[PDB]
From Swiss-Prot:
The chain holds residues 145 to 201 of 230 of the full protein. It comes from the Eukaryota. It is found in: Membrane. A zinc finger (RING-type) spans 18-55. This is RING finger protein 141. Coiled coil: none annotated. Disulfide bonds: none annotated.
Length: 70
């Protein structure tokens, strides 16, 4: 009713934020709706322009590319 400690108006200043950890802000953003902060980006040795999320292709769409022997 007329009680409660938490539960007040919260400014929407924030606009974007990492997707992996989602701390508060995002260092960069991808054209596929995927952002990553310095922390994470740095963590992932292979920080190639390539997108990690998409790369996974988890229940995405029919796209044949091919494995990587290396
Ligand atoms: Zn992050
Ligand atoms: Zn992506």
């Amino acid at each position: 009713g007329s009680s409660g400690s938490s539960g007040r108006v919260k400014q929407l200043t924030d606009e974007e934020e990492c997707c992996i950890c989602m701390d508060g802000r995002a260092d960069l953003i991808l054209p596929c709706a995927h952002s990553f902060c310095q922390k994470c980006i740095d963590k992932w040795s292979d920080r190639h322009r390539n997108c990690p999320i998409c790369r996974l292709q988890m229940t995405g769409a029919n796209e044949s590319s091919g494995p990587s022997s290396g």
